[PDB]
Design a protein around this nucleic acid. Structure first.
Ligand SMILES: OC[C@H]1O[C@@](CO)(O[C@H]2O[C@H](CO)[C@@H](O)[C@H](O)[C@H]2O)[C@@H](O)[C@@H]1O
Ligand SMILES: Cc1cn([C@@H]2CC[C@H](OC(C(=O)O)C(=O)O)C2)c(=O)[nH]c1=O
Ligand SMILES: [Mg+2]
Ligand SMILES: [Mg+2]
Lengths: 554, 416
DNA sequence: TACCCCCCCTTCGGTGCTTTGCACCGAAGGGGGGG
């Protein structure tokens, strides 16, 4: 005699009605197994039979559990989905083993047939109506409505999930020295109790749950490590991922690389040093899923290096709130960074990677800051605190960067870890004009219609150059002119442009760019000894600005 | 047995649907304790996933305060709720407040928990407390009473509020009082001693209503009478290099969008040749008057630049380096209502993000006192950087609107 | 021929200043993972 879980009032989106979508054809084998499952639910009280008065139907289908003989019932409630009220999802994130503390006694249980143990809202039941073909469209078939949460309805996860939390509520308040991680129906329960008093609490937990109609089959009652949980394996002092299966295939498509690149992402959380840049590049293009793609010399080099990491089996440790957190980052080249979070040397809680390339033109310092930001945020999710950082950048480098950059930037408490390759600034523009360096007034223009252009400069010692350009734009020519100035000058040079665009890019000290021309300019800047860039408004009759503007407009 | 004042959102608008951001351990613990005590007192009640609305929540410590204070980011809800100006509920703004010698800011949001909130409106105040490592699904509450941080609450509470201060006002008719959100602005020309004295009187006075019909005791002391303006200034030199004059001309040509009478013809002439940036060049007789004439123009105020109460305020901030930050407040481009500069704020030489947070709070406070409005900020910082750290440094009970810009400084315009 | 969550990598259209090109960013659609 169960205490039934009070229902949750659910409405449809205003002035929309119920679904009326008739069943798509069922191949013969399909028609049968479905019929027996229906009859079952009716006996259990999970589904009511009525159908003259409910005008509605939603298509039904069924697919098997993975590696199981059994068949699982699915509803195509997607039409109902568009028409149903919105929900606020109470599931905000995924628990991570590296956030758990060590427990003396641990249990893992699954509630059995979860959605079907929680009563759908009384008034809403009629829209769940569906129709199943009795014998391949000979006679009408049977109508049914759901009495519990049906799989496929957008409100089923949130509603089950919230009810589950209200059910566990009194058990938690009156057992504050137990820990229960609820992620849908799968429960982890840990205590610093004697395995005797623990097995008791578990059974008390199972009782309270059954009092509300929640079964916990023994078949799902893991009692001995290694605990299978959230795709991980929990041992008493270390965790790791459930085995990663990497395809070793000789022919690679797009879809193989997506699957391949995805699995490595998932592996990066504990197997340190994972790289996916080259493999992901092999993916960039309108390339459809079927088209086959040969790897690059440098690309299958990456794939090979990854395997070497995945050969060993790696494991993380668990969290000790009494010890500091430590995050350590290494530069991996081409905008790749990895990190490790740990509290004692070589006992990593977890690892990860940041490789996002944001901006056409960037540098390592920005990317490291972004990586710091990713790690800081991830940490607040898992442990609720910010780690101390160990970073491959000289204190002086950071000081020069953040104090001189025109945007506000910052990195929390950190210390230098001398692990090459170090992050550094590759050049610095002077703050004041350089005495005894040649002044180059640069400008560039293109014709919007011809897309033909010129770039050049005039100099205070009389030196001049103009270069004709084909298939170009205003902004390209402006960069080009600065390049010519840098190419044709000595080691110390003053440059005067009127390109707001050009000065913007160069002043953020990029060290890498999507533009071949910008990299060429970057490459010139690194070789110089002193460079002073100066902006003047165009068309205000200044300097060589008017003298070079008439060269490259005519 | 008090009857709730109905409140409606703007026609053709849904409620807020803003995702909760991750919270540090200390903030969640403070929030769980605070929400527990509030639920026991009927102020909030537990809700489910069938309410589709959400407003982010977090927690702060005010300046020099050791006790955590709940803060709801009601920015979304506030911009979707009926303006009460149309209703005629809205509070008028006293032009005299900015003129007083001392203005103390008192947190009085606590008063608002006394007043029931309209049943049909409660669902819009839904928030979700998160948990470390997602041990639990989010725990959703909604408000039953007037919530701190909602623009509807001072509106609806004004009647009781005017009645409470009524005695104090008649006794001390020289003292200015302005209510903005959860804060009370109390200004006087008294000497400092009697000012703090009078503030204590008003506070004990507040206790007498509290017995009868985060904490109330705190108070921050402003001095609006001494608020400087940072105007545009040209350098003073006896010898100018080509570079210096190029900077000056670019600056003057930029300024001309603000002061139209500025001229650069005579100055531009000194740059005719293709000369070395480092070369010293004498100003022509014509050029010196032009420079002097421009200094005169920059000394006087811009024409036809006045506050329009129906338009929003905008604030731009520039990082000048070495701990100096400049700002301008405007409603229309190049018609600045105020310009200014801050230096040596908390975080100088170590933390840009703390400094900018202080700057934003300082500017907002000035905007509330001067116009009774909070500006929308254009922040010189990448979005991800800002969103990661600002709540560590936030000390105010309101949150201004903001957006992100990236404007490299080509002219050193507001700072020399 | 289903649902809800989180993640990374890419593409693409909308937006606003670098302007009629170019840079940034969020959404969406691919993959990984969970129940
Ligand atoms: O930083 C802006 C960023 O925050 C979000 C997420 O909650 O929205 C908040 O900030 C906005 C900017 O002021 C407000 O307009 C909004 O109401 C508030 O919830 C994102 O929407 C936005 O990108
Ligand atoms: C895998 C899967 C699960 N679910 C539900 C989530 C909670 C319920 O739990 C299960 C149970 O029935 O016991 C379960 O323990 O796995 C089933 C779906 O809706 N769609 C799905 O593809
Ligand atoms: Mg189960
Ligand atoms: Mg030109």
């Amino acid at each position: 005699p169960i205490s039934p879980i009070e229902t949750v009032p659910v409405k449809l989106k205003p002035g929309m009605d119920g679904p009326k979508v008739k069943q798509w054809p069922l191949t013969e084998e399909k028609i049968k197994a479905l019929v027996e499952i229906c009859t079952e639910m009716e006996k259990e009280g999970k589904i009511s039979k009525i159908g003259p008065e409910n005008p509605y139907n939603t298509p039904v289908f069924a697919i098997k559990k993975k590696d199981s003989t059994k068949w699982r019932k699915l509803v195509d409630f997607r039409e109902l989905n568009k028409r149903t009220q919105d929900f606020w999802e109470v599931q905000l994130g995924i628990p991570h083993p590296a956030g758990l503390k060590k427990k003396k006694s641990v249990t893992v249980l699954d509630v059995g047939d979860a959605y079907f143990s929680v009563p759908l809202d009384e008034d809403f039941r009629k829209y769940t109506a569906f129709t199943i073909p009795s014998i391949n469209n000979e006679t009408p078939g049977i109508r049914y409505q759901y009495n519990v949460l049906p799989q496929g309805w957008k409100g089923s996860p949130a509603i089950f999930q919230s009810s589950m939390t209200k059910i566990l509520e009194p058990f938690k308040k009156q057992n504050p020295d137990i820990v229960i991680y609820q992620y849908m129906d799968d429960l982890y329960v840990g205590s610093d109790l004697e395995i005797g008093q623990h097995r008791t609490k578990i059974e008390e937990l199972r009782q309270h749950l059954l009092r509300w109609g929640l079964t916990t089959p023994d078949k799902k009652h893991q009692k001995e490590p290694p605990f299978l949980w959230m795709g991980y394996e929990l041992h008493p002092d270390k965790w790791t991922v459930q085995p990663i299966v990497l395809p070793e295939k000789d022919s690679w498509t797009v879809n193989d690389i997506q699957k391949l690149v995805g699995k490595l992402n998932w592996a990066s959380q504990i197997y340190p040093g994972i790289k996916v840049r080259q493999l992901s590049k092999l993916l960039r293009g309108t390339k459809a899923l079927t088209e086959v793609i040969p790897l690059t010399e440098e690309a299958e080099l990456e794939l090979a290096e990854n395997r070497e990491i995945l050969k060993e089996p790696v494991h993380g440790v668990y969290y000790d709130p009494s010890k500091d957190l430590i995050a350590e980052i290494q530069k991996q080249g081409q905008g790749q960074w990895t990190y490790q979070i740990y509290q004692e040397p070589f006992k990593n809680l977890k690892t990860g990677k940041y490789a996002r390339m944001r901006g056409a033109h960037t540098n390592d310092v920005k990317q490291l800051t972004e990586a710091v930001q990713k790690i800081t945020t991830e940490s607040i999710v898992i442990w609720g605190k910010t780690p101390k950082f160990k970073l491959p950048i000289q204190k002086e480098t950071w000081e020069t960067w953040w104090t001189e950059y025109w945007q506000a930037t910052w990195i929390p408490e950190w210390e230098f870890v001398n692990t090459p390759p170090l992050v550094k600034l590759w050049y610095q523009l002077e703050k004041e004009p350089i005495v005894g360096a040649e002044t180059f007034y640069v400008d560039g223009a293109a014709n919007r219609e011809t897309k033909l252009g010129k770039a050049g400069y005039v100099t205070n010692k009389g030196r001049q150059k103009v270069v004709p350009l084909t298939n170009t734009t205003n902004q390209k020519t402006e960069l080009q002119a600065i390049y010519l100035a840098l190419q044709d000058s000595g080691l110390e040079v003053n440059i005067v442009t009127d390109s707001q665009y050009a000065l913007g890019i160069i002043q953020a000290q990029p060290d890498k760019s999507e533009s071949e021309l910008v990299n060429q300019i970057i490459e010139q800047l690194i070789k110089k000894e002193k460079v002073y860039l100066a902006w003047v408004p165009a068309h205000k009759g200044i300097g060589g600005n008017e003298q070079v503007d008439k060269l490259v407009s005519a | 047995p008090i009857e709730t004042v109905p409140v409606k959102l703007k026609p053709g608008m849904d409620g807020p649907k803003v995702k909760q951001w991750p919270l540090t351990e200390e903030k969640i613990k403070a929030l769980v304790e605070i929400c527990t005590e509030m639920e026991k007192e009927g102020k909030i009640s537990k809700i489910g996933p069938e309410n589709p609305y959400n407003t982010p929540v977090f927690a702060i410590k005010k300046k020099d305060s050791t006790k955590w204070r709940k803060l709801v980011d009601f920015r979304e809800l506030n911009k979707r709720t009926q303006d009460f100006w149309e209703v005629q509920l809205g509070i008028p703004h006293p032009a005299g407040l900015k003129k007083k010698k001392s203005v103390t800011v008192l947190d009085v949001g606590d008063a608002y928990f006394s007043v029931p909130l309209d049943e049909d409106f409660r669902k819009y105040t839904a928030f979700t407390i998160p948990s470390i490592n997602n041990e639990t699904p989010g725990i959703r509450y909604q408000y039953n009473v007037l919530p701190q941080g909602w623009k509807g609450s001072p509106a609806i509470f004004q009647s009781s509020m005017t009645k409470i201060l009524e005695p104090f006002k008649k006794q001390n008719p020289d003292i200015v009082i302005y209510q903005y959100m959860d804060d009370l602005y109390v200004g006087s020309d008294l000497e400092i001693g009697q000012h703090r004295t009078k503030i204590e009187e008003l506070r004990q006075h507040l206790l007498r209503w509290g017995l009868t019909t985060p904490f109330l005791w705190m108070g921050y002391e402003l001095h609006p009478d001494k608020w400087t303006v940072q105007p545009i200034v040209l350098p003073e030199k006896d010898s100018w290099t080509v570079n210096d004059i190029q900077k000056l001309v670019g600056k003057l040509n930029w300024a001309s969008q603000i002061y139209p009478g500025i001229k650069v013809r005579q100055l531009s002439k000194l740059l005719r040749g293709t000369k070395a940036l480092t070369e010293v060049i004498p100003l022509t007789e014509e050029a010196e008057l032009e420079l002097a004439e421009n200094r005169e123009i920059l000394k006087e105020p811009v024409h036809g630049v006045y506050y329009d109460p129906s338009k929003d305020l905008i604030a731009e901030i520039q990082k000048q380096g070495q701990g100096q930050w400049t700002y301008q407040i405007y409603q229309e481009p190049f018609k600045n209502l105020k310009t200014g500069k801050y230096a040596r704020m908390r975080g100088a030489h170590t933390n840009d993000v703390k400094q900018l947070t202080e700057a934003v709070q300082k500017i907002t406070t000035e905007s509330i006192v001067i116009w009774g409005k909070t500006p929308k900020f254009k922040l010189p910082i990448q979005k991800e950087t800002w969103e990661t750290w600002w709540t560590e440094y936030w000390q105010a009970t309101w949150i201004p609107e903001w957006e992100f810009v990236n404007t490299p400084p080509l002219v050193k315009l507001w700072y020399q």
